[PDB]
Amino acid sequence: PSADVYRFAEPDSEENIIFEENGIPIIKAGTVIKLIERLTYHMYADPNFVRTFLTTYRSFCKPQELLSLIIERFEIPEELKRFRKEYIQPVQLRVLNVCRHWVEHHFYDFERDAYLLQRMEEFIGTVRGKAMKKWVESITKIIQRKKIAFQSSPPTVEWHISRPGHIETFDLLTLHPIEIARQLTLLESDLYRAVQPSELVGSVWTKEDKEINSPNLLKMIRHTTNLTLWFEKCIVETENLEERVAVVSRIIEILQVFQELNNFNGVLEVVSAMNSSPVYRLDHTFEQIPSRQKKILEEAHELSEDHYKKYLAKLRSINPPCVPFFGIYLTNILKTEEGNPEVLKRHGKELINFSKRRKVAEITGEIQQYQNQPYCLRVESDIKRFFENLNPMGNSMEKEFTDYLFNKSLEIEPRNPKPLPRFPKKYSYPLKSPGVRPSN
Amino acid sequence: MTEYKLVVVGAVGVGKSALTIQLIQNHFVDEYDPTIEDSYRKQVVIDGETCLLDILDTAGQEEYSAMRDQYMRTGEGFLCVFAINNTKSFEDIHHYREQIKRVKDSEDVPMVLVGNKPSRTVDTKQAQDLARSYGIPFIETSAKTRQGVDDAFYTLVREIRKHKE
């Protein structure tokens, strides 16, 4: 095309671009110049690469640098009629499509760096093509918008001992187990759906800025942790054996409904509490759990065995809405980024390793697939508020609180040969469960 | 053949994952796919005995702090990892070890202390003395050069064998 006063015209070679060999070519690695050339290629559209590049590029190119490179790509120096029609026009359009996708789907780059947006608006003001007026206007409309800030009838809310409005009596045994599961599933589905790819790519939730870069993810994990700890505390603070057995049974019924809702985060919240050192050792309590409820917990725990083999199969087999367990994605993203080189070298030259970026984008893409579909369930504001405000640790630090739970376990069921004390009841109301069959 | 269930534990960012990946990878292949079994299961020969190592590395899930008991309960022996440039990760080790003993309901759990290689803030002598006070081996590694990686996992396998005998 052009001579080499346009860096993107340098011929492909093994030392600037590598393709995957296992429709559109898939780039395994390239110089950033070749990546941006193929991102805005003249011979074909590549929407998948546009999506994965704009999701992952900040690990190998700063936002200001990317804008400079795409403006350089657009400003092509000049049969010349053929060149304009077959090279300049299609590349320029492709560039504008990348700009539009960038401001539409990754506007946080501009929110964090106001000068990046100034440069973008200045660049768009230079594009005069009569053809490109529609792209110009479309991009301006999105920018102006960004700068400004039940499918079916839901079933009846279920109630047990606590009556509507009596917030102050809400507790694990007094709310209805169906409704505890429903309201935790709505809360956990909302927390899951709020996590954005910018909180994940680059493993930024593991780095020193994690609280500013991954707030929604961390809020979600802290809810899961607090619910697991609340289940543990409810169990070990119930000193009387029959009452405790009723508490463990009720948590397993909540687990049964989590499974019916495909809320795997809730399933794991229960499984983790039952695996915890203060709970797992309670021989006398588990002995009294009905066999049919043992079976429910047994099948849930088995989802985690063998590196989550049965979990992964079950998730692939159900239909949304669902709430995935996020921790698997986190380990896979982290290991994908740490286990593959940042750059490949070829006859002395460095190429950006884009395949590991693509692999991370495939994970964030699966996360996003499960975020589309909401639950057809009605919120109950007081119950939602009760769970949003759970704080089982109180004022204690992690170590002090988990030592408290374990000492409570040793008090309520002492180690052999020490004798098993009897303990007074604490629950004034009936322990019988209403079950987990809904009304109508 | 004998299978060993190993669990890697430690603070965020100390190189748990790099150690595991460097163990599993064939030496000159730099392409890791964590979604398949061969990424965490490896057949090796140690002191003449051939075995299968199954390594549970949950790096990236450190914020799920109430799931540690569940993960630790799956294991036979533990690699307790800290970063030699990160003093807090070394101070955390005591808490991981106490949590493991509680989960395993045992005072002698097969375990190896690993200090993985900014500059050094934890003295070799301090880590050796801590390991000695626990009755366990200490091994320094550099996941990046692969130095000490096999020694760390094989030493843990040896500890598991000594415990079963």
Epitope: R281, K294, N416 | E3, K5, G75, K104, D105
Partner: nanobody
């Protein structure tokens, strides 16, 4: 894929003693509960004795005072000391393991004949 390997058993005079032994083959952590069940001709299989990793035990009423169960947690082995055997103790005896406190799935040994002659 844990397997339970039984040993002991066989023929013994009434009034005498036998020790049954059970060893789990391939396990990564302490089996929560190990025990023995038996099945006499014409009868259902019934619990004889079991013991948790925390040392809590159950004995069938018909063997209390005569049979003792013991285990070695670290080794996932257990044994059953059967004293003052009676012809009614003749049965196939099975080692049993429940992996977790919520386990309902059974791991069973192959079964060991015990025949008490009078």
């Amino acid at each position: 894929q844990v397997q339970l390997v039984e040993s002991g058993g066989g023929l013994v005079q009434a009034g005498g003693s036998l020790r049954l032994s059970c060893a789990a083959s391939r396990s990564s952590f302490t089996i929560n509960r190990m025990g023995w069940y038996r099945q006499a001709p014409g009868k259902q299989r019934e619990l004889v004795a079991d013991i948790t990793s925390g040392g809590n035990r159950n004995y069938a009423d018909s063997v209390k005072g005569r049979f003792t169960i013991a285990r070695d947690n670290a080794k996932n082995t257990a044994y059953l000391q059967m004293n003052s055997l009676k012809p009614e103790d003749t049965a196939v005896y099975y080692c049993n393991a429940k992996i977790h406190p919520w386990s309902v799935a059974d791991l069973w040994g192959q079964g060991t004949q015990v025949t008490v002659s009078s």
